[PDB]
Amino acid sequence: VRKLKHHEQKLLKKVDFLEWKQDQGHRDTQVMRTYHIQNREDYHKYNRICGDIRRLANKLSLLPPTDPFRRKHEQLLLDKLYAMGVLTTKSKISDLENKVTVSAICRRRLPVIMHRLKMAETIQDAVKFIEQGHVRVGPNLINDPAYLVTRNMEDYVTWVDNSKIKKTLLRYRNQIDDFDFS
Amino acid sequence: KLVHDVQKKQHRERSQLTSRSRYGFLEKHKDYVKRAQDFHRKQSTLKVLREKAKERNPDEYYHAMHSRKTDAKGLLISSRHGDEEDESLSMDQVKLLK
Amino acid sequence: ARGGAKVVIEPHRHAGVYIARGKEDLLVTKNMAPGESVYGEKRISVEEPVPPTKVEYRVWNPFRSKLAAGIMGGLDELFIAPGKKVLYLGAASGTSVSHVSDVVGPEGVVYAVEFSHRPGRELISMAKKRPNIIPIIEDARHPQKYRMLIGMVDCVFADVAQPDQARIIALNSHMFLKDQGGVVISIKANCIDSTVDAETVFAREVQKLREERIKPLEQLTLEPYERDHCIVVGRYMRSGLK
Amino acid sequence: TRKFGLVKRTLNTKKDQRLKKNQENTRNIPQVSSALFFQYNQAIKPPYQVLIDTNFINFSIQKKVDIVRGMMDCLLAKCNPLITDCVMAELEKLGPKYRIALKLARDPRIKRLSCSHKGTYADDCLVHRVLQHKCYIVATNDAGLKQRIRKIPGIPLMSVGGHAYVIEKLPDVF
Amino acid sequence: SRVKKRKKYQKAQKKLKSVRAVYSGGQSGVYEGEKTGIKKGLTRSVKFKN
Amino acid sequence: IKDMFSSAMEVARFEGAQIKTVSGIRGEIKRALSKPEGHYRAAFEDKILMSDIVILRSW
Amino acid sequence: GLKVPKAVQKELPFKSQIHQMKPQKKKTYMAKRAVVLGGDEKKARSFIQKVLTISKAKDSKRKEQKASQRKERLKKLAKMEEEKSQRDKEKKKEYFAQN
Amino acid sequence: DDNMRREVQRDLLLIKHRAALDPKRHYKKQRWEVPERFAIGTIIESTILETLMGDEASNKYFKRKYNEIQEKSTSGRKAHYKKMKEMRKKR
Ligand SMILES: [Zn+2]
């Protein structure tokens, strides 16, 4: 507000308009920038799931360790959370509470994957190509930027065929073929 | 420590057989170790460079694929003059430069 | 180091001071009154654009001036500046005070103070080509005598070799010196005390300055140029000396 | 003609200036003294000017020596011992069961010299009066202060042991 | 031994010109400034810490 | 490697021998080359030069 | 220098394609145009190329002189690190021999 | 300005590398980036590039000390490569 003086300071030791304990460090904004996600409520739509992983992790930690339910049941779950690809490794059972973060689930987003597979140059520019309609998964093109992509389905993202951005790529290698009308 | 000055004397190195002087300069050990380092300083930057050939991912699109062009053999060409401004003189510039 | 060679001038880290980066380097300040060197030092000329005007630069001999080595030994903050008033003490001639006039420029003034008449007579004749120098020929031990002539100076300079050097600055720092404006003492070890050592006088004259509410910032020794001196850049706190 | 990849404008934390934590956003090489030789310190000649700790006074009482008369036995020349203003502020702060040291500290042959500090802590008042001049001769018996001065070149440290005092870095012992 | 004392001190007086800038002579020549050069950013001055 | 062994039978008395060079690389001598009477193939650990002189230690 | 095979150089990703400028053969108009000041300027252009040769090599020998004495100093430095390593073990026996 | 550059550019390039001009001087170690504002001038009581090559003692020094580095930089490279391929081929 004012860079209040030293005697103003001690009466206002606690007031701050920009940063609140309720606001929690602005972690939600801070990862919305790093992954460039469109609408604001998208974070806490993941962070309700990413919290719900840990609540199932916790009560499955409260069962006794030599229980053939419990031993079966999180390894049943780490099969799925690795196939979807939110977590890097399948070995640790305590990745399921420690490595399950929103920024883990927010980088199996489609524009991050187009930046991981070096399709677009940056991560904003990949959102620019999805929204304009140049990218596709198998048959159908995808148009929501915020498409989660399975690690299995991560094989199949390509540029949409006959596009003006898959035509320019093939001109760089001097390998167009207009019988494909690339 | 406890060693004479004669025990640390010298051991000189001998030269090429003078009958075999055509194939000049016999290489000792310390002249081989300059040769096998900087072959392994070539493969280790070539096996890496061949490893990027296996993983090209041919859907990659960087936005500087308009200024670069490629020769018909397949490897790219870059201009001698380098700059964006030394391309080719216009007819009005030649009409002044002549 | 001849009259033929051409030298690059470059602004020093301190304002108003200029370095002459040649084959060897020189310390240089712009001559306010061109065409005349006041004690025969070799002066540099340039030209700046009407045909280009002549701007003459005068070399700043280290061995002549006790201030001069401290620049060339390296001081962090020299409180003399191209706009500020500056009080000078013990300017026998224009050996150094003509230099201090040129570095404060045509805006700020310099108050030359020295007691003796025959060096003071020379200080008059130089002061009528440099408008900044107004010379005062009263004794520096009695500042109430020239109280009418000087008002609110921004940094004093002390080149007195009298052994009561701390009291002769306190009576000039309390009554003339603008608060929070620095004090550049130049201590000579032989002229204060010849019995005790060179370094004791330096530890004695600093502690005498701290009694007079001058927190001294840094201390230089200027040894390769002059034997056994110090210049001690102070700051006149007067209020919050801690 | 609206732009692509639009996103709700929101508050940068790593970059904005209005935040408190983000509000924040010439070398110096001190010359080794013109007195000093490699370690010899060729300037110090008698009489000496010796700084004194709290601890040097306290062990002076237990070992039954005068300050001034007892220092001249160790030192063999004349000396002017001088307690700073920080050190006298410690001797008062030690309190009631050290008051016999506080009487012996204020003696008109024991000089006092002021300092310009914001503090009582004289263990670091003292080294700072030593680096900037190197004419003094520190009298301590603090363990950490000895290690703080034995790294400084050319400063005769002085401690009390057994009967009389001892000096360390004087080359002119006798 | 009186030579090795001489050739030590004469060797350990060259080092003294390299650690600090020791006084030498005066100025007997004509020239004013410095041969080795000026630096702007050195500030070889003991600053009085608080 | 030439002119170390005289006959192709002389090589066969010596195959499997840990040959070394001046440069310090090791190797073995493996088969007697036939069509000239003296020479033999030898596998070193790295590419021998032409300028290099193989020596087989013996007692 | 290393010479990459062209079959390796062809299928490289776009980030790392090595820029190898072909030599020019047909004489450019500019290289038939430009004037070279000869005579007195040649004596003052040979000389600058003769000074900058000296000051590059005087640097790269003295810069090599530091990393020769860097190698010697850290050998002397690690020897002082080893004595402060072993003797620090010996105190923590003679301390805990009391305890 | 960008006029009168050449007699200035040769001069400043002869000051950024002034350690090499005489093997007895050995200035302090500094970098001397070209400053933003400067004014080349002479000493009142022939630019330094023209001044220096008019000397004979320095000009005989650089011709020796340039051939003596270029006797070293040539030494391994390709004249030495062709001679070793020459003696194998010649006999
Ligand atoms: Zn204090």
Side-chain angles (χ1 to χ4, degrees):
Chain A
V1 279
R2 195 260 189 91
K3 185 179 168 64
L4 39 86
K5 276 84 70 176
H6 187 84
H7 84 95
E8 313 287 328
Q9 171 63 255
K10 304 293 191 293
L11 275 69
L12 300 182
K13 194 85 73 67
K14 193 175 177 179
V15 309
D16 200 358
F17 297 109
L18 287 308
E19 187 73 25
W20 290 348
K21 287 180 181 177
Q22 175 265 325
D23 195 359
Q24 63 182 3
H26 278 283
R27 184 69 58 79
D28 56 2
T29 292
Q30 185 174 356
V31 79
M32 280 172 64
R33 295 185 181 278
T34 313
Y35 291 139
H36 189 79
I37 65 102
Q38 300 296 109
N39 48 1
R40 187 182 175 90
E41 196 68 27
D42 200 357
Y43 178 81
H44 305 91
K45 204 68 62 66
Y46 291 118
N47 210 163
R48 192 176 305 280
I49 301 160
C50 183
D52 197 358
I53 301 297
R54 296 185 184 180
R55 186 177 62 192
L56 189 57
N58 193 10
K59 298 184 185 298
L60 279 167
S61 178
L62 300 187
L63 270 66
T66 61
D67 186 351
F69 178 81
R70 179 183 189 266
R71 302 189 61 78
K72 190 260 183 182
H73 204 80
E74 300 105 14
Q75 191 68 40
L76 212 290
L77 185 145
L78 285 184
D79 193 3
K80 189 179 290 184
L81 276 290
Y82 174 67
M84 199 177 299
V86 315
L87 45 84
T88 63
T89 176
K90 195 177 179 180
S91 67
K92 297 293 294 296
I93 197 73
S94 174
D95 289 331
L96 211 157
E97 194 269 335
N98 198 1
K99 296 294 288 183
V100 180
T101 60
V102 179
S103 168
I105 204 162
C106 196
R107 72 174 74 94
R108 299 300 304 172
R109 295 280 292 269
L110 186 65
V112 184
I113 287 302
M114 287 175 68
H115 177 68
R116 291 287 186 271
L117 297 176
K118 302 168 78 173
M119 282 181 175
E121 189 182 4
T122 65
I123 189 169
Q124 182 187 3
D125 288 328
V127 179
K128 190 174 287 189
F129 289 120
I130 296 169
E131 194 72 28
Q132 289 162 355
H134 293 299
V135 74
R136 62 103 178 266
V137 180
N140 45 357
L141 82 131
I142 194 75
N143 203 357
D144 289 329
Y147 177 70
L148 201 283
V149 49
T150 307
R151 173 174 286 117
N152 194 2
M153 195 58 71
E154 196 265 330
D155 194 10
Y156 295 152
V157 289
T158 59
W159 298 106
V160 74
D161 199 1
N162 76 24
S163 173
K164 202 177 283 293
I165 210 73
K166 195 253 186 64
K167 189 173 181 181
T168 296
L169 158 62
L170 268 69
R171 287 176 179 173
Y172 176 73
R173 301 297 175 92
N174 202 358
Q175 287 182 354
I176 57 174
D177 188 358
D178 293 334
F179 180 71
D180 296 332
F181 51 97
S182 300
Chain B
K1 180 63 174 64
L2 208 290
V3 158
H4 296 293
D5 198 359
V6 188
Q7 189 169 3
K8 289 186 177 180
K9 187 178 179 180
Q10 188 60 41
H11 300 97
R12 312 178 74 190
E13 67 183 6
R14 78 190 78 183
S15 176
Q16 182 61 250
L17 278 81
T18 312
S19 299
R20 209 194 186 193
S21 177
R22 301 170 66 189
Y23 306 150
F25 185 65
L26 175 62
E27 291 187 356
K28 303 293 179 178
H29 181 75
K30 66 182 181 181
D31 292 328
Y32 161 72
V33 79
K34 289 174 185 176
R35 200 266 308 279
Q37 292 297 320
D38 205 1
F39 176 72
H40 293 91
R41 287 200 295 266
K42 290 185 187 298
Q43 297 303 110
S44 64
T45 71
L46 213 287
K47 184 186 294 295
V48 170
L49 204 277
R50 191 188 296 115
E51 184 178 0
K52 291 187 184 296
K54 263 62 182 297
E55 301 175 357
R56 184 166 62 85
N57 189 4
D59 294 333
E60 62 175 6
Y61 172 72
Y62 295 0
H63 286 283
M65 291 184 183
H66 291 82
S67 180
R68 293 182 183 176
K69 293 182 180 180
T70 305
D71 193 1
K73 189 172 182 181
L75 66 156
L76 87 164
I77 56 173
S78 58
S79 294
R80 268 84 73 183
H81 309 292
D83 285 325
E84 69 274 15
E85 49 89 23
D86 288 327
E87 299 176 354
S88 68
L89 302 178
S90 175
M91 181 55 67
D92 198 4
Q93 295 179 357
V94 177
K95 193 178 291 184
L96 201 154
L97 263 70
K98 305 300 282 289
Chain C
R2 293 184 181 181
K6 295 182 175 67
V7 191
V8 176
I9 305 299
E10 184 181 3
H12 202 277
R13 179 174 59 87
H14 305 290
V17 189
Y18 297 103
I19 314 169
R21 297 287 171 92
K23 185 174 179 180
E24 55 267 16
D25 297 338
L26 289 76
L27 192 62
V28 154
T29 294
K30 185 185 291 183
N31 204 158
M32 285 183 63
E36 178 176 356
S37 65
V38 293
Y39 56 93
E41 68 275 25
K42 59 183 184 180
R43 72 264 193 192
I44 301 169
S45 70
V46 298
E47 60 186 3
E48 177 180 358
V50 61
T53 60
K54 177 175 70 177
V55 179
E56 176 173 351
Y57 285 88
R58 200 172 74 251
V59 77
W60 184 282
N61 202 167
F63 299 92
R64 298 291 192 183
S65 300
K66 298 177 185 177
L67 176 60
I71 298 296
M72 198 152 168
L75 290 173
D76 193 2
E77 184 178 358
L78 187 74
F79 279 95
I80 304 167
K84 292 183 184 179
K85 296 176 181 179
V86 54
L87 210 167
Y88 201 92
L89 279 83
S93 179
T95 305
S96 177
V97 66
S98 64
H99 286 288
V100 180
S101 177
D102 295 334
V103 75
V104 303
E107 179 68 30
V109 298
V110 56
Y111 300 100
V113 169
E114 200 273 332
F115 175 65
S116 183
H117 293 88
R118 295 169 300 167
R121 184 176 295 173
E122 295 294 326
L123 180 57
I124 297 294
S125 294
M126 183 186 68
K128 292 178 180 178
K129 292 183 174 66
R130 286 173 180 78
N132 297 324
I133 307 166
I134 48 170
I136 315 298
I137 319 296
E138 197 65 27
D139 194 1
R141 292 184 179 93
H142 298 85
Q144 292 88 17
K145 290 183 178 181
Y146 54 93
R147 71 174 181 272
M148 296 177 71
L149 281 75
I150 304 172
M152 285 293 109
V153 80
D154 203 2
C155 57
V156 308
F157 184 83
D159 204 359
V160 286
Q162 310 296 320
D164 49 357
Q165 192 176 5
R167 178 256 185 88
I168 202 171
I169 300 305
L171 291 174
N172 284 314
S173 298
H174 292 298
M175 197 167 71
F176 288 96
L177 177 64
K178 184 185 290 186
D179 188 351
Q180 295 290 319
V183 174
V184 183
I185 304 295
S186 177
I187 301 165
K188 183 174 181 180
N190 287 318
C191 287
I192 292 174
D193 292 329
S194 64
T195 63
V196 302
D197 292 325
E199 191 70 31
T200 300
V201 178
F202 294 149
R204 183 173 291 167
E205 288 291 325
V206 166
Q207 197 272 334
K208 286 181 182 178
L209 289 184
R210 295 173 187 170
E211 298 178 2
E212 306 295 326
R213 289 189 300 279
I214 299 171
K215 176 180 178 180
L217 295 176
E218 66 187 2
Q219 174 185 359
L220 191 143
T221 320
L222 64 97
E223 200 187 8
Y225 295 105
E226 291 286 329
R227 183 176 177 87
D228 197 0
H229 286 83
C230 275
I231 58 168
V232 182
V233 179
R235 178 169 289 170
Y236 187 72
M237 289 296 176
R238 204 187 188 183
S239 67
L241 189 271
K242 294 182 182 293
Chain D
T1 65
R2 50 174 289 166
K3 294 180 180 180
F4 297 100
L6 286 180
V7 62
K8 187 170 186 181
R9 181 173 171 85
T10 175
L11 183 138
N12 268 306
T13 58
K14 299 186 295 296
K15 191 174 181 179
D16 196 357
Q17 292 176 357
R18 294 177 296 177
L19 292 173
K20 182 184 286 184
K21 72 181 183 68
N22 205 358
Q23 191 61 255
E24 299 293 327
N25 300 321
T26 305
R27 290 187 292 114
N28 190 3
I29 294 173
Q31 54 184 353
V32 292
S33 175
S34 291
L36 196 67
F37 203 65
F38 290 97
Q39 298 290 319
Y40 171 64
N41 194 357
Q42 71 196 2
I44 297 176
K45 82 173 186 179
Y48 295 170
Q49 292 174 356
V50 34
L51 308 170
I52 290 172
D53 274 339
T54 304
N55 293 317
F56 183 75
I57 298 294
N58 283 314
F59 291 105
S60 178
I61 304 300
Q62 297 178 358
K63 290 179 170 63
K64 259 61 184 301
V65 290
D66 302 332
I67 297 301
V68 178
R69 186 176 178 178
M71 189 171 294
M72 194 185 291
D73 291 334
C74 172
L75 198 277
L76 291 175
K78 189 187 288 185
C79 61
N80 286 317
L82 43 98
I83 296 173
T84 77
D85 194 76
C86 289
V87 179
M88 193 61 67
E90 288 182 354
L91 267 292
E92 290 170 347
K93 193 175 290 186
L94 262 292
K97 59 185 180 181
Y98 292 90
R99 65 182 291 168
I100 192 162
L102 191 274
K103 167 66 184 67
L104 192 272
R106 293 181 297 180
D107 178 354
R109 58 182 180 171
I110 302 294
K111 292 184 178 180
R112 276 178 283 172
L113 84 174
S114 299
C115 59
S116 66
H117 292 158
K118 194 181 290 290
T120 298
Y121 183 66
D123 197 8
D124 206 3
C125 176
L126 209 63
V127 170
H128 282 102
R129 299 184 78 83
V130 162
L131 267 67
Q132 295 159 355
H133 294 293
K134 301 182 188 297
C135 186
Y136 292 150
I137 165 167
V138 186
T140 183
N141 200 0
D142 187 356
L145 180 53
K146 286 184 180 181
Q147 305 304 114
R148 185 168 167 83
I149 293 176
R150 288 170 183 174
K151 297 175 182 178
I152 304 163
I155 301 299
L157 193 145
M158 188 172 188
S159 61
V160 50
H163 295 289
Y165 299 151
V166 289
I167 36 90
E168 294 190 359
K169 287 184 183 176
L170 274 177
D172 191 359
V173 177
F174 65 99
Chain E
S1 297
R2 65 179 296 283
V3 184
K4 192 172 181 178
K5 296 293 183 181
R6 180 178 182 178
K7 284 175 67 69
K8 199 189 298 290
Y9 172 72
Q10 191 270 125
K11 185 176 179 181
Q13 195 174 3
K14 306 295 179 66
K15 295 182 179 180
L16 182 62
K17 289 186 179 179
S18 177
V19 178
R20 68 177 180 176
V22 67
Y23 182 75
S24 295
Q27 188 271 131
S28 180
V30 177
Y31 170 71
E32 294 85 354
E34 196 170 3
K35 291 184 178 181
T36 313
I38 311 301
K39 289 195 185 183
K40 306 197 291 183
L42 268 174
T43 308
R44 300 293 296 272
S45 176
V46 175
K47 287 185 182 181
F48 289 108
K49 294 177 181 178
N50 297 319
Chain F
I1 299 167
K2 71 181 179 180
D3 69 354
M4 186 173 75
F5 293 156
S6 299
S7 71
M9 299 179 67
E10 180 169 354
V11 184
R13 194 260 175 281
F14 281 144
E15 73 190 5
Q18 187 169 357
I19 179 68
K20 68 184 288 291
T21 324
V22 172
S23 296
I25 57 178
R26 270 77 53 87
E28 51 177 349
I29 77 103
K30 287 185 175 182
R31 291 293 304 271
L33 258 289
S34 66
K35 293 180 182 178
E37 67 179 2
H39 322 312
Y40 65 97
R41 59 181 286 266
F44 285 152
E45 61 181 356
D46 199 355
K47 178 173 180 292
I48 193 61
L49 282 314
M50 180 52 68
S51 300
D52 204 354
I53 299 165
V54 303
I55 56 101
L56 184 143
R57 64 185 291 157
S58 170
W59 294 288
Chain G
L2 80 164
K3 293 180 182 178
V4 183
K6 294 183 183 294
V8 177
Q9 181 178 354
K10 187 170 73 174
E11 288 97 6
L12 284 173
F14 180 73
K15 183 186 181 295
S16 185
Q17 287 186 353
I18 62 101
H19 292 74
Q20 182 169 358
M21 288 184 278
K22 295 179 179 180
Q24 63 94 28
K25 300 178 181 180
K26 189 173 182 179
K27 293 177 72 175
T28 317
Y29 167 70
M30 299 306 292
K32 291 191 288 184
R33 176 180 177 272
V35 57
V36 285
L37 283 307
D40 197 3
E41 283 287 331
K42 183 190 285 188
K43 292 180 181 179
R45 187 171 63 249
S46 169
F47 179 75
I48 292 299
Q49 184 270 124
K50 199 171 268 77
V51 171
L52 297 179
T53 297
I54 306 305
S55 179
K56 283 290 291 294
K58 188 179 288 294
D59 192 4
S60 293
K61 186 174 73 174
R62 187 179 177 88
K63 180 63 172 63
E64 190 271 335
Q65 190 65 256
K66 303 295 183 182
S68 177
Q69 289 179 356
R70 180 182 183 175
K71 185 175 181 179
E72 181 67 29
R73 186 175 184 270
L74 270 73
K75 182 173 72 175
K76 188 176 180 180
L77 194 146
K79 186 177 179 179
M80 291 181 183
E81 183 67 27
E82 189 68 30
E83 299 295 327
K84 290 183 180 180
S85 69
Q86 288 178 355
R87 188 169 173 84
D88 201 4
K89 306 297 192 294
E90 294 178 354
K91 301 174 189 179
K92 291 183 180 180
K93 291 286 104 177
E94 296 295 328
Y95 178 73
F96 291 106
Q98 293 180 355
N99 298 113
Chain H
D1 292 331
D2 204 4
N3 284 321
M4 200 176 72
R5 282 294 93 198
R6 186 57 62 199
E7 296 88 5
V8 169
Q9 179 61 42
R10 298 284 178 84
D11 188 352
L12 272 70
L13 193 62
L14 201 69
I15 288 172
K16 184 181 184 296
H17 296 81
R18 64 181 177 181
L21 270 66
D22 201 3
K24 295 183 185 296
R25 297 304 304 270
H26 295 165
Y27 299 139
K28 288 184 182 179
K29 48 173 70 177
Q30 66 185 0
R31 291 177 175 177
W32 203 67
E33 293 179 356
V34 173
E36 186 179 2
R37 297 182 184 274
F38 60 92
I40 297 172
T42 174
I43 293 173
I44 290 178
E45 286 183 354
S46 69
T47 317
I48 196 65
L49 184 66
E50 180 67 28
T51 302
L52 180 59
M53 63 184 69
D55 186 356
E56 185 67 26
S58 295
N59 201 1
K60 190 178 181 180
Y61 164 67
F62 295 121
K63 184 175 176 65
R64 180 184 66 83
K65 189 65 174 174
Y66 179 70
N67 284 317
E68 195 269 334
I69 171 177
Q70 207 178 9
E71 193 179 4
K72 181 175 75 178
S73 297
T74 307
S75 67
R77 302 294 185 92
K78 283 183 181 180
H80 181 270
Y81 174 70
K82 289 177 188 175
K83 278 172 64 180
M84 298 307 109
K85 293 293 183 179
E86 189 71 29
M87 295 189 289
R88 294 180 184 176
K89 186 179 183 292
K90 183 178 177 180
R91 294 187 70 191

